[PDB]
Design a protein around this ligand. Structure first.
Ligand SMILES: C[S@@+](CC[C@H](N)C(=O)[O-])C[C@H]1O[C@@H](n2cnc3c(N)ncnc32)[C@H](O)[C@@H]1O
Ligand SMILES: C[S@@+](CC[C@H](N)C(=O)[O-])C[C@H]1O[C@@H](n2cnc3c(N)ncnc32)[C@H](O)[C@@H]1O
Lengths: 337, 337
């Protein structure tokens, strides 16, 4: 069977969930074979080759109504935290926001910058919880900026601003007590330059908190290993996402210094994408109606839905692999050098 | 059975090699159970607790004739490198010296400092290979200084000096192009202060190369877990040796920045201690004769020999565990911040 044949059946809804999960699990299984080496000597050789390679490098948006139908209350687009099997996505968003506040040592009165803030759930959480904080979200999306500002207005929050910028091009002398990067570093083409830039927005009193999807042992770009992987390039059509190992950022301490380091087991991410998948499925009719005017045809709507749903189904297999002990979430706390 | 009972039988030579190896292997097996955690989340919690704990902290010598009877030609007292099963200890010393020169990027004309240089094998190797290098060994032993200076004289080397100092107390404004630390960091009570001090002896052009015994996954002090471990406190009577994880020094980048990172599989160390054990056994009669005047009695001689021989037997079990994939040697290359 060819890529086109599997892709044809997928877009027509001919692949059942059981087969779909099985196919994507097998693709990730092959990535594990690719990444694990027989000795720690070889593992470190492999890992350092990847780290060295990184140091040499360098219109359409979904309507808010659709995003509200698929994601949780604050439209968090990152791994959440589930205390219980019955923890709801809304509760899991709040729990994850609270976890970031604890680990980033957020205190009332601080200036806070959230880089790649998305729909601003964390920005709004900190602003509401800590009235004397000033909280700045930075996003490259005008729609996202507008969404956050509307929400801040509705919530009577007067301590929020949003910078509309590509972070890689943003120039400022402004510094912040706290810089947060929640599942945004994965999209950075030049990590060393990114960390350098962030350090210039810090004083000696500042802390930097990074949360990123990882594998516990090795790093990889999110891409097809071989011609049998129809999945990776379907989810991310460009070579834009890097999955760092849980320890990869320890080698990016030119300009910042590590203070603490954690991982959150992959079942939390698994439960996050599962919740999004189930909510989308529940609101399927409504989602199709929302997307129709902006996409022009039912076929274009089906394609967008298939893409997001498959992202969740595949994400589930990736992060649930070996009870969350392969792909997971890494977190690190840094000070300036 | 008690500690004293096993220790009594050991000192009397009543424990055969098979039983001795079995007993020490079991002690190290229990250390593995202690160190491995069920999830990477728990592993990192455990590892960071250890790293944080480190950041809060802080007459008799063996005659050269005995050392020559037990160790290889240059009396190297660190893991060596064995290309073949039939590689001799002398060849393995030279191979390891060459490996350090390659990985530390030693070039003719550089100033080189070797911290805790021991009997000076590496100092003498670099001095002979690179005539325009000036090579300084630093050791806390007057006997070692005298040995190195005699060897340099015999070898017609004019580019060697030795500093007699406790490195933790040594104060100087002198800087070096290359600083080498070969299995000495294990003895440092305050690692953060140690790395800070080393950085002050570096310029922007300098490199620092550290080689240390490690476990691939976790860190531990070389000490008894429980009352059943007669071995650890017999080998090192004080709490003076720390076995860092293969990645532990990545968290000590306040003052230096990582450039490269390797491990050497534990079978190389295993073959090193095996070679020392076998050479001591071959030269047993001679060793007893050498040690007798300085120790006063045959019983005191037996005790010293038992200690060193057991060190080798135990070291073999430790480093050969799972074909060298538990305890091994970590190497790191740094520049100044
Ligand atoms: C997976 S999301 C996470 C968003 C948010 N932090 C959260 O937890 O919900 C990654 C975000 O990074 C943003 N992003 C990617 N590249 C960027 C850039 N160069 N400048 C600013 N934002 C960027 C994306 O638009 C996206 O909103
Ligand atoms: C295992 S040996 C390695 C010696 C040598 N680098 C080699 O590879 O053969 C560790 C050395 O560090 C030395 N050492 C320990 N503490 C020291 C200190 N505070 N100052 C200087 N040397 C020290 C010990 O005396 C010992 O020679």
């Amino acid at each position: 069977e060819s890529i086109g044949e599997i892709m044809g059946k997928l877009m027509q809804g001919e692949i059942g969930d059981e087969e779909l999960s099985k196919r994507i699990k097998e693709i990730f299984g092959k990535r594990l074979q690719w990444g694990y080496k027989p000795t720690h000597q070889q593992q470190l050789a492999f890992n350092l080759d990847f780290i060295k390679s990184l140091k040499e490098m360098d219109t359409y948006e979904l309507p808010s109504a659709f995003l509200e139908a698929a994601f949780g209350k604050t439209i968090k687009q990152s791994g959440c935290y589930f205390k219980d099997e019955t923890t709801t996505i809304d509760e899991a968003e709040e729990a994850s926001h609270e976890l970031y506040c604890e680990r980033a040592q957020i205190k009332d009165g601080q200036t806070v910058l959230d880089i790649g803030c998305g729909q601003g759930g964390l920005v709004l959480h900190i602003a509401q919880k800590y009235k004397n904080c000033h909280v700045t979200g930075l996003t490259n999306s005008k729609a996202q900026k507008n969404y956050i500002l509307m929400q801040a207005e509705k919530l009577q929050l007067s301590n929020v601003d949003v910078i509309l910028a590509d972070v890689t091009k943003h120039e400022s002398d402004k510094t912040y007590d706290r810089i947060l990067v929640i599942e945004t570093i994965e999209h950075m083409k030049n990590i060393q330059l990114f960390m350098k830039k962030l350090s210039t927005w810090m004083t000696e009193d500042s802390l930097l908190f990074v949360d990123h999807i990882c594998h516990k042992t090795f790093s990889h770009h999110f891409e097809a290993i071989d011609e049998d992987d129809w999945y990776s390039g379907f989810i991310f059509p460009k070579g834009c996402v890097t999955i760092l190992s849980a320890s990869a950022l320890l080698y990016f301490q030119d300009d910042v210094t590590i203070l603490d380091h954690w991982v959150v087991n992959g079942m939390h991410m698994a439960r996050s994408v599962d919740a999004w998948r189930k909510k989308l499925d529940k609101n399927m009719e409504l989602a199709r109606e929302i997307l129709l005017p902006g996409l022009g045809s039912k076929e274009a709507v089906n394609g967008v839905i298939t893409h997001i749903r498959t992202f969740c189904m595949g994400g589930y297999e990736q992060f649930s692999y070996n009870n969350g002990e392969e792909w997971m979430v890494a977190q690190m706390l840094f000070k300036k050098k």
